[PDB]
Design a protein around this ligand. Sequence first.
Ligand SMILES: CC(C)=CCC/C(C)=C/CC/C(C)=C/CCC(C)=CCOP(=O)(O)OP(=O)(O)O
Ligand SMILES: CC(C)=CCCC(C)=CCC/C(C)=C/CC/C(C)=C/COP(=O)(O)OP(=O)(O)O
Lengths: 359, 347
Amino acid sequence: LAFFRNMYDKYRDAFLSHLNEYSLEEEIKEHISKYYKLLFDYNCLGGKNNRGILVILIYEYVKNRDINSSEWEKAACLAWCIEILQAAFLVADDIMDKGEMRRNKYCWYLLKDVETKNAVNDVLLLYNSIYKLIEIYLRNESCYVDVIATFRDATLKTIIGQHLDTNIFSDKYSDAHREIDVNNINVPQPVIDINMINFGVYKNIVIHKTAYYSFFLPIVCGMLLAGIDNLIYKKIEDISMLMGEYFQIHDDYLDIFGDSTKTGKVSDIQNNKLTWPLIKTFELCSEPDKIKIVKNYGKNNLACVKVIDSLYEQYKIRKHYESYEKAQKAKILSAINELHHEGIEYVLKYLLEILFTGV
Amino acid sequence: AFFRNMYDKYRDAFLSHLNEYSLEEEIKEHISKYYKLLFDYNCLGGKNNRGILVILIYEYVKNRDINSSEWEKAACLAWCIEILQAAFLVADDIMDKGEMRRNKYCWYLLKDVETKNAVNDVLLLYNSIYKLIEIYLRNESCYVDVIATFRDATLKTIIGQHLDTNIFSDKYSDEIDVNNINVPEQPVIDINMINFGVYKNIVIHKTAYYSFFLPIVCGMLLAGIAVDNLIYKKIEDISMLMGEYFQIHDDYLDIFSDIQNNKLTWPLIKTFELCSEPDKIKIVKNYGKNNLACVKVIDSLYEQYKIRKHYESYEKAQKAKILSAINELHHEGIEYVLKYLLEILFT
Ligand SMILES: CC(C)=CCC/C(C)=C/CC/C(C)=C/CCC(C)=CCOP(=O)(O)OP(=O)(O)O
Ligand SMILES: CC(C)=CCCC(C)=CCC/C(C)=C/CC/C(C)=C/COP(=O)(O)OP(=O)(O)O
């Protein structure tokens, strides 16, 4: 954990050293290293590092065995690669959702020395840096191809979850009969589609957007590098899905019922997002309140968000979350005990306890 | 060249992969509708020089019989570079706030798309390449080397793109202010960066590697020419010369949005080396401005210093320099392709 955090610079400078080998004039090289050192530092440092720590712990507990410094160097590489992946996702998400704060600092894209134009380019650099690092440190491992495929496949699932989260209430999803007009370049007003306000659709989004890169990818990383393919991978796939759902519902809860100075970020109601509080309120509310939701949800105006916010207090959404949290935490524990692997079971139970705080 | 008929197979091969995801049937139909248009709109319509370059290099190295299955792997790599070009095109238009590309509206401008989807779509298109390389080349021995060639060429392009975006920025003039989100920096020219050395650094990284090196290395790797072969460095040097040649022509075409977008172009560097001191101040005062009078002034200086004639002089001198480097290859098959590519480049 403290070891993992200390290995950071080794991986950052290994990648910066690779760019430094490029055939460029010495002055250009120094500007590049100044820019990219800050890109990594600013966006890779500051989170709970749950995904990174999950690799390290799964690598150690897959089997009780001797692990040399060189083997740990490969494990802390994969651990930092998932943090770089989280860093790329967060920069991209903030551009896309027009974010203000992340990890108690300004969104990288808002910086006037950066802007959207560099941030778009920087998402791809951070994303490609992962595969450069896995090559530098795992080039000769037999799990190499399987590890790169795991990153590639989790990323693809996240891109699809991101697409669904962005477009679930869009005109092209509500008007399936009409093709996308490639001649219309006017601005779209976003409104909810009640046919999509259901937990079935929610799970489809949340599993793809969070479960695969936050839980499946780090666990499979630790296991592939340890040397294990086996029927346990499907069992860990199912647990990852349940943990992803659990993690995202809490993230939704935090968005409306959390302090920005504690979470590090200020938007779901204004951004017209399909959230768990929205689905819960909709199943529990009266017909006039349903129409009141449709009229005020997805609007940048503070008086419209207050209407939604007041309705969340009215239908005591915080208490329903508390009841969901206990029902799901218990459900995941049950699935973990059906694993029949004491090592992984220990890590997953520990991860489940430390999820919302980190460490 | 049956490469155009193979498009749908690679498109559907990737779409079929997404279709295997655990999603409700209605969600699957919306996804396939969206992503079929994303591929079609951005992968079809270009000259396909990069795609064709793979096919031609593959054919003229393997001077022997090539079966349908071997061509299926070659046209996969060829379409992968076209998907890469598609991902670059979409990203570039978001970044440069483009209006038109290949005689149609930029994908990000579309009402049903917007910048938010366009950012996400660049990464889908980009990752679809590696899914396709896996589907069709996972059992080839060149597999790892091919993926490494795509990764390394992309990394170089990202760096050239960074340089092209920031070469005149206040951060490149002499630390980045992580507290400034409110004071927008006005775009301005930096005369210390108006030189051919800096320009070659940008152009080689931004174009040469993915436009020439990557497609040639793809054909060669798939044909079976070993990575340890000294010819790869020779092809690297030719790719750099061809990249420079291709980009200078692209800059020439733009004028005869770069002026308004404050870009370091070959006509700007040429005009600056050839013009008087009052005209240098006139360039600094009018370049990089979204005002019609300002662009008109820069346009007139390019006409005055007959930049079109200097390009014509450059194009003849550079063409010879590459032909000379191509003849030092000692490979009749590749040499024919490179000479043919050089003739057909602009059309
Ligand atoms: C890594 C990714 C996908 C990206 C983000 C940012 C980067 C590095 C971007 C793109 C910069 C780039 C290489 C740009 C644009 C050049 C372009 C689209 C084209 C012109 O090529 P032609 O061959 O003349 O056009 P056709 O394809 O239409 O024939
Ligand atoms: C392929 C790439 C890089 C991207 C483009 C677009 C995609 C797929 C998206 C990103 C959307 C996404 C999954 C989001 C962000 C989630 C996020 C930053 C959040 C919260 O996780 P925590 O674990 O709470 O944060 P810490 O890492 O700070 O602990």
